[PDB]
Design a binder for this molecule. Structure first.
Ligand SMILES: *[C@@H]1O[C@H](CO)[C@@H](O[C@@H]2O[C@H](CO)[C@@H](O)[C@H](O)[C@H]2NC(C)=O)[C@H](O)[C@H]1NC(C)=O
Ligand SMILES: *[C@@H]1O[C@H](CO)[C@@H](O[C@@H]2O[C@H](CO)[C@@H](O)[C@H](O)[C@H]2NC(C)=O)[C@H](O)[C@H]1NC(C)=O
Ligand SMILES: *[C@@H]1O[C@H](CO)[C@@H](O[C@@H]2O[C@H](CO)[C@@H](O)[C@H](O)[C@H]2NC(C)=O)[C@H](O)[C@H]1NC(C)=O
Ligand SMILES: *[C@@H]1O[C@H](CO)[C@@H](O[C@@H]2O[C@H](CO)[C@@H](O)[C@H](O)[C@H]2NC(C)=O)[C@H](O)[C@H]1NC(C)=O
Ligand SMILES: *[C@@H]1O[C@H](CO)[C@@H](O[C@@H]2O[C@H](CO)[C@@H](O)[C@H](O)[C@H]2NC(C)=O)[C@H](O)[C@H]1NC(C)=O
Ligand SMILES: *[C@@H]1O[C@H](CO)[C@@H](O[C@@H]2O[C@H](CO)[C@@H](O)[C@H](O)[C@H]2NC(C)=O)[C@H](O)[C@H]1NC(C)=O
Ligand SMILES: *[C@@H]1O[C@H](CO)[C@@H](O)[C@H](O)[C@H]1NC(C)=O
Ligand SMILES: *[C@@H]1O[C@H](CO)[C@@H](O)[C@H](O)[C@H]1NC(C)=O
Ligand SMILES: *[C@@H]1O[C@H](CO)[C@@H](O)[C@H](O)[C@H]1NC(C)=O
Lengths: 450, 450, 450
């Protein structure tokens, strides 16, 4: 429904389209952060530092444990039902996340079993296999430093030095835990934490964790780049100091009929002024419908755009009509003295603002002049097979854009300034004029009677 | 003064209120960054690396020392007066900071005493306690690495290797000093630096520093999360290479009469279109007055909102009237196809857009239908004690909201698009119409005297 | 062309001007990232880890190598021409970057020479002196760790432990390579990467690299602070696992006739309301023209503001006329209860809002009262040589601003609210009024002729 012919007359072309894929999650795995390292081979040389580390962790873990218990106390078997009167107030996201928290909850007996299995481990990353259960992955954030650096030096360094070295690592690890799970974490029940954000808490790298979870394949890099691998908090243990997370590797589903277009613009000249049409960087089409496209959570892979959130949001009716071929609906803005988008290659042709750059025909050696009654030049092989546009020599193919029409056959839109202060200054001026004409505007019917 | 009854008719409710606390500082402590480590036990193996490290530090420290001297030269005893004619131009913030710099500074004789005490220490963190003065905390950024890693290896590694290892740490530490205090630091006189931003310069962790400064208590986590612990520069020494900072632990004072409200919204349906009322996330009230609330510097603790800056700023009169019960003043926007806020639990009742989600009464198994001449459904126990709204079973309490009124009894506001380009396109179109009607608008009085 | 006299009547002054300098590149140097470390002295204790590291690197390097080959295949000797019909679609930036890529491409014979020289080195940073060509700088990201930590410990640590320690470093280095050159880097051809963003890939610090490249001088800190040292990808080798970059140290050219002004405001009082003129933080003048100034890529050095991008962009005509002396064109906004900009020192005089702060003359003890028919007070020595404004004692010089005129001789502009939602609410209200008056508005000819 995008009218490319009319858009090209104001210097707007598309430079690439792609399919739209979103993420859905079906399976969830468990990942436990083991906050207490195994220090058996350090022979009580870190007793003071460990005790301080535990005290600091309690101030972070206790508020989260209370928050989790506050929601799960209001969920009972019906399926399950929520005691809305007891809960009082909650958003849809909180309610949905609370149900999943109650469902994807390790049973109390499994918690006792998990506690014992954690105590016997001394590795940084270990899979815990319970009979007739899903594998639980346990990660200890300072175990590698203990096993690789501190234990081999036990016969070389003093007992006090060993404690000091571990103490530095423990306090830095607590800082990261405070950053992730401290007061900055609004609503732990509904929080979704990306695997990258957990990197330091997992030992400073996620590659081994991803391998142990079995997350691999051709879509991994795109999914990972869009931050599509998310973890949710399901249990906080303040007695044994561990945190249970539920993590899911999503599957990609193409959305039928959605095309994501990348727009690109070239400036044009009206006399001695250089103007530029204001259009979005990306737009989405589905049949007749035109919508904006938010690329903030998307990765543009060769096989399509992978987005970890909903990227489609509505576009105003006036902007839609601009994209449907109404040039007078499109706004335009002035450009700085040194503007880089003064020509573009599109469908084998050159669309250039030859009033602001030097257009020369390399084949004949002649300079290409842009008529003052026109705003753009459409260069194809029928007029110049090889062209020098800005000192760059380019060969162009057969004509795909008609020869430029006069300015009087193009209806141009209003000039605007997009800056925050410019908008405020011009809007206040407009509101003042409307407020000064209120008496005229209110009596519209009486004036229209005459 | 917020009219909750009329707001709920367009799907706006409050999901929580809290008190408002601000920070004030009374006492200040001195914290000196000792840039030159103690390398006595390294036996001259780092001579070249230390010399290069000193040269790089001078390029950073000298501009700051000149800036500090340029301000203090204009402050003289009256109990001090600023020579405004000599200074020429200065903002209020610069003037106030300059007075504090002149007041809160170690005297010249105390600088010599501080210089001698710094040279004799060899620890990463050490309290310097003078006769009849406040304690001064000295921090050395690479001393832990020297004491824990380099010195124990002196009899194992070559002299060349020792220098190379420390040289790497010195350059990395200089990079952080350049980031903190280099050309990016506009106006060192009035700059306030959070303790978190100093973390690397203090050795990579702030927990021990806070303990030594005596900063503890139940408010620490909230204050630290809001970045309420700030340091200012009071002295730069380019001969012994240290920086003196003044740091204050704030006290929290609740502002009486201020309530911070968290607003949440549910979409509503007009025929087949799904609309959403646009309102701020947080608003503040003080009696009859309604203000915007900036949450950027705030932390939402269970006992109230802790902010390190002033969070209240004015709200436009039209938006205030919307919050006072004028529904026609409130703007509305279209939502994407997959919208998450289609129901909410409030006061034990469910406010749901039953035209966009399937509402069913679990008690009787009957579907709940939303009439076309209504926009929302208000579910309470008198109609359905247990209800399923989006696959979630919820029990609701007694009625706290009236049954939905017809759409013709609700005055709805204007549809808008909040995006930056949509605003520019629509504002430009509006301005063009006003400019084309200038003659009619400027001749209003003639049209009215008839 | 800025009218300072009329601006001071609404509390706007300049607090400093500076010259404007931009960056141009003439010479370029080659920097090669050597992804494979030298591990000869580790006696194949890291065989498994190295094999995994190479496998991960291939998934990142191969897409980039294909992208580079896609552009360079379309560039042939004319002194080169682009096959636009084969390329089809490309922006000016992509075309210009592609030409430089073809020109700055190391020839195939030089690539074989470079491959052999990389294999023989074992240092973290090393210059490769190719005969009859420019010096090529080779950087290895983990070589320092191998040479300083692992090799001296070979006789002490187990062979398995050596592999584990290096494996941790390799996976972390790969993560940074994925961040820099992975799917997040769209269009590698035109990408420009700052030297700071390459810091981890170069071993965690750039100071030695800058010294080896010869980049030094008095402008280094300013150029580095504004991110003016940028690298482009010119070759990717998937057989020997290295990346060639082109890096340039820019030269600064002052732009003639451009002055960058910093603006600062003071609040004023109308009755009991405190207002503030809304103006940009920085503005630029060139003769008669007035432009906005983007400070995002600029560093304000004592010798002038150094910018790595074009900082000038157009300013709306209404805002320009405000700065040219039309006070009614300038918008104004309400301020919060605690506003810091209630006085300013300018040209040795104090401009103060004495209705909102306590102004008293220290010389005579009398309080300075601001008349309700005035909005500001201009304090000079002819009325009070030494004045206390907000508890701060300031001496002021001779009069440089006339005595405040009455409010009825000042034309004030429209009140506005700059917030995103406040703009949307008020714009929607204004659009609705225009839409309700559409029939009247498109009747101007009939209404006047009556
Ligand atoms: C810490 O690690 C040690 C091993 O270094 C653990 O001891 C192991 O415990 C398991 C229990 O299943 C036994 O199968 C192993 O034989 C034990 N190994 C050794 C060397 O004794 C120990 O349980 C861990 N936890 C604590 C608290 O010490
Ligand atoms: C493509 O652009 C042309 C030129 O702007 C449009 O022609 C205008 O059409 C309107 C009616 O919609 C007429 O009132 C104007 O006079 C025309 N302007 C001209 C000829 O300069 C044309 O409608 C656009 N095409 C589409 C499909 O929107
Ligand atoms: C570096 O540290 C050493 C200690 O390792 C300092 O020497 C100490 O100086 C204090 C001065 O108050 C004495 O009380 C200690 O007895 C000294 N210790 C030793 C072991 O001699 C030394 O002063 C520091 N460096 C410099 C350059 O002064
Ligand atoms: C609550 O909303 C109702 C409905 O929008 C408001 O009723 C309007 O009141 C104005 C006068 O303020 C009348 O001109 C309109 O005709 C009414 N609209 C209706 C009944 O649909 C009511 O004023 C609002 N209450 C408050 C306190 O603002
Ligand atoms: C790895 O480093 C070694 C040295 O540690 C390199 O061997 C040197 O190579 C240079 C250049 O050919 C010779 O001049 C030296 O005599 C060599 N030294 C030794 C001790 O043999 C080696 O080439 C590097 N690369 C590899 C792949 O091993
Ligand atoms: C400086 O400000 C004064 C006061 O606002 C401006 O005087 C106005 O001038 C316009 C014409 O431009 C008259 O219509 C108004 O009546 C004047 N307003 C007054 C006197 O209050 C004056 O023009 C401004 N100077 C410049 C150079 O723009
Ligand atoms: C040493 O550590 C062991 C194992 O935890 C413990 O049982 C014992 O009491 C410790 N001895 C001390 C702290 O003296
Ligand atoms: C070597 O460096 C040390 C560093 O402490 C210094 O004190 C000493 O004077 C230098 N020279 C000699 C000869 O030790
Ligand atoms: C690995 O190193 C050992 C060191 O003892 C050597 O004997 C062996 O030949 C090496 N193997 C290979 C495949 O290079």
């Amino acid at each position: 429904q995008i009218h490319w012919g009319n858009l090209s007359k104001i210097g707007v072309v598309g430079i690439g389209s792609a399919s739209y894929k979103v993420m859905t999650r079906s399976s969830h795995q468990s990942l436990v952060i083991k906050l207490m390292p195994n220090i058996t081979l350090l022979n009580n040389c870190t007793r003071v530092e460990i005790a301080e580390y535990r005290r600091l962790l309690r101030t972070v873990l206790e508020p989260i444990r209370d928050a989790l218990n506050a929601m799960t106390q209001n969920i009972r078997p019906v399926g399950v039902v929520l005691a809305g009167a007891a809960l009082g107030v909650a958003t849809a996201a909180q309610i949905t996340a609370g149900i999943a928290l109650h469902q994807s909850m390790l049973n109390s007996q499994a918690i006792d079993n998990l506690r014992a299995s954690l105590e016997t481990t001394n590795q940084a990353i270990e899979a815990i296999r319970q009979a007739g259960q899903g594998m639980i992955l346990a990660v200890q954030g300072v175990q590698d430093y203990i096993n690789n650096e501190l234990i081999p030096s036990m016969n070389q360094l003093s007992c006090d030095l060993i404690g000091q070295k571990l103490g530095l690592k423990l306090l830095r690890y607590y800082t990261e835990i405070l950053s992730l799970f401290g007061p900055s974490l609004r609503d732990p029940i509904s929080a979704e934490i990306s695997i990258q954000a957990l990197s330091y808490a997992l030992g400073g790298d996620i590659n081994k964790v991803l391998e142990k979870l079995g997350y691999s394949g051709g879509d991994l890099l795109g999914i990972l780049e869009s931050r599509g691998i998310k973890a949710r908090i399901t249990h906080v243990d303040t007695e044994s100091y561990f945190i249970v997370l539920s993590i899911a590797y999503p599957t990609l589903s193409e959305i039928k009929g959605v095309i994501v277009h990348r727009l690109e613009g070239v400036s044009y000249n009206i006399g001695s002024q250089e103007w530029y049409t204001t259009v979005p960087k990306y737009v989405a089409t589905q049949g007749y419908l035109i919508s904006n496209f938010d690329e903030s959570s998307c990765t543009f892979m060769p096989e399509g755009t992978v987005c970890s959130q909903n990227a489609l949001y509505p576009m105003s009716p006036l902007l839609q009509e601009c994209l449907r071929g109404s040039t007078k609906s499109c706004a335009r803005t002035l450009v700085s003295g040194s503007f880089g988008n003064r020509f573009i290659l599109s469908q084998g042709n050159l669309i250039a603002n030859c009033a602001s750059i030097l257009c020369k025909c390399y084949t004949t050696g002649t300079i290409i002049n842009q008529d003052p009654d026109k705003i753009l030049t459409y260069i194809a092989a029928d007029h110049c097979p090889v062209v020098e546009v800005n000192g760059v020599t380019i060969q162009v193919g057969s004509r795909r854009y008609p020869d430029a029409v006069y300015l009087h056959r193009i209806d141009l839109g209003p000039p605007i300034s997009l800056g925050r202060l410019d908008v405020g200054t011009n809007l206040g001026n407009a509101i003042a004029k409307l407020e000064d004409a209120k008496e005229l505007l209110e009596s519209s019917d009486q004036i229209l009677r005459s």
